[PDB]
Design a binder for this molecule. Structure first.
Ligand SMILES: CC(=O)N[C@H]1[C@H]([C@H](O)[C@H](O)CO)O[C@@](OC[C@H]2O[C@@H](O)[C@H](O)[C@@H](O)[C@H]2O)(C(=O)O)C[C@@H]1O
Ligand SMILES: CC(=O)N[C@H]1[C@H]([C@H](O)[C@H](O)CO)O[C@@](O[C@@H]2[C@@H](O)[C@H](O)O[C@H](CO)[C@@H]2O)(C(=O)O)C[C@@H]1O
Ligand SMILES: CC(=O)N[C@H]1[C@H]([C@H](O)[C@H](O)CO)O[C@@](O[C@@H]2[C@@H](O)[C@H](O)O[C@H](CO)[C@@H]2O)(C(=O)O)C[C@@H]1O
Ligand SMILES: [Zn+2]
Ligand SMILES: [Zn+2]
Ligand SMILES: [Zn+2]
Lengths: 183, 185, 183
């Protein structure tokens, strides 16, 4: 129960533009009050698989959202599929879907839901990853905690780039970050 | 201090003094993962000289420092910029009710990061990161964290915030950054 | 056995271009399914000790390799010397070489060895460190998992820079990252 993850294989588990067009590899490891997170993305098909901004000047970003209920269970309207998001067992998952993962949720006092109170930037982490592992192909991964509506907690990953990439496949290096846990 | 968390609490009540009393909330979370401490930090400035940055009217205002000084037992000293009242081991979204007396396992390692001396000062006692003001991607600032370089204490963690862009009336409140350091014990 | 490391003093323990020309400080802490890593480097002598790209325009990168066998034991072709890598015991290392550390190896499903199949970028993490701690002296540390031959697992650090440095001592700030563990 110390690690929630997508499993480390490369089987598509995420829908960005079309069904199962990407494998989001996400590992959440609970280190007490902080969750240590490691993430990467491989797009395998669809609109975001091969980026060509000469042809499509406007395709410059996309978002992957993980929505969770009060028990920390993933809601089906998340881009990530519920099928293989579970507690780890070896290189796979436990046989049964979990019913509670509140200790992996982002803290609501640190990262409040939208309200009419002042919105602070501490609920965002910025990182840079590299497409195809090439140092001159950076893309920004912006992670935001608890800013989606229709859920009790949320983790969203926005990927964007500013260079005019020509036939660059969207598959990334890995990024680590952490966040304060709800409990 | 097996896997405990030493923190500032996650609320937004000012707990730090940069230029004037209680002008900011430093949110700092230190979690012990054996020989390394996993740290998560962000800063909200609410008043004073560093609250709203205008480098067109004040081009020389480009950096400031927040210092956490600790004694031989890992206890935070009162002359640190961070206040002592809400820096303690975590209990729910708050702190345990007794001030801690020992936290040596959360201190930066003295062999990895020696106190100042006339021996060579190696760069490994610094970690650099970039955070963003207001969560805007076009508003970077550098957070430089240095271990054990202050005097008047046994251990120290110093945060230096600086920026090179010429900001015009930009509120200094930041995104979060994670780093780790080698623990003393 | 929760931390494998190099002792964080300044005694040389690594051979880049000549014997014991550097001190790699590496700490690997097992946080369950993820290893939390912290690395820095001091070059004390030889070719990479003082960088002068006016004198040597093409000296712009070097690599430090850690190669491990099936039991997670460091192999002698690694740049890091075997006498310097062991589980922590206070501020030093245990007195006898360890026999197993498979739980510290980079996961082979997440990071496969080279083969005929498509190679994904998720087996790389990029970071930037700073020479002499100066903010205007960045160098890239690229860390790759399980891409070397002659071993069962590997962690390799490639240090490179794009600026023309003139008489700059190669000793760095520290970088943290994590990776998915084998067991
Ligand atoms: C710690 C850090 O982030 N260092 C940066 C560094 C500093 O921001 C700068 O030296 C502070 O004055 O900048 C580096 O890039 C320089 C580069 O920055 C671009 O944004 C700008 O468009 C260029 O004109 C040029 O200034 C540097 O090498 O000094 C990068 C380094 O990582
Ligand atoms: C992994 C990394 O930090 N990548 C950098 C990248 C590399 O440092 C560089 O390409 C060598 O591999 O540099 C990036 O920035 C570039 C500058 O170094 C260069 O001076 O100017 C470029 C544009 O003219 C560019 O800005 C890059 O290639 O995009 C930034 C990237 O994070
Ligand atoms: C979150 C992050 O990486 N932010 C970058 C920022 C963004 O990449 C960019 O604003 C998105 O469009 O870019 C910064 O640097 C800019 C350069 O990428 C650009 O080519 O030139 C700009 C000046 O005209 C600027 O230098 C930025 O906006 O400051 C750097 C920042 O870290
Ligand atoms: Zn593809
Ligand atoms: Zn304000
Ligand atoms: Zn010398």
């Amino acid at each position: 129960t110390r690690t929630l993850w997508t499993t480390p294989d490369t089987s598509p588990n995420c829908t960005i533009a079309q069904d199962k067009d990407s494998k989001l590899t996400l590992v959440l490891t609970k280190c007490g009050s902080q969750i240590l997170a490691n993430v990467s993305l491989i797009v395998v098909a669809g609109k975001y698989h091969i980026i060509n901004n000469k042809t499509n000047p406007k395709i410059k970003s996309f978002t992957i959202k993980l929505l969770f209920n009060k028990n920390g269970v993933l809601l089906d309207n998340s881009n990530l599929g519920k099928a293989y998001w579970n507690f780890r067992s070896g290189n796979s998952n436990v046989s049964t879907a979990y019913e509670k993962a509140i200790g992996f949720m982002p803290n609501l006092v640190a990262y409040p839901k939208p309200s009419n109170s002042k919105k602070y930037a501490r609920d965002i982490v910025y990182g840079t990853i590299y497409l195809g592992g090439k140092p001159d192909q950076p893309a920004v991964i912006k992670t935001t905690f608890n800013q989606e509506t229709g859920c009790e907690y949320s983790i969203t990953f926005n990927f964007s780039w500013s260079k005019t990439y020509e036939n660059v496949e969207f598959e990334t290096t890995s990024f680590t970050f952490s966040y304060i846990a709800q409990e």
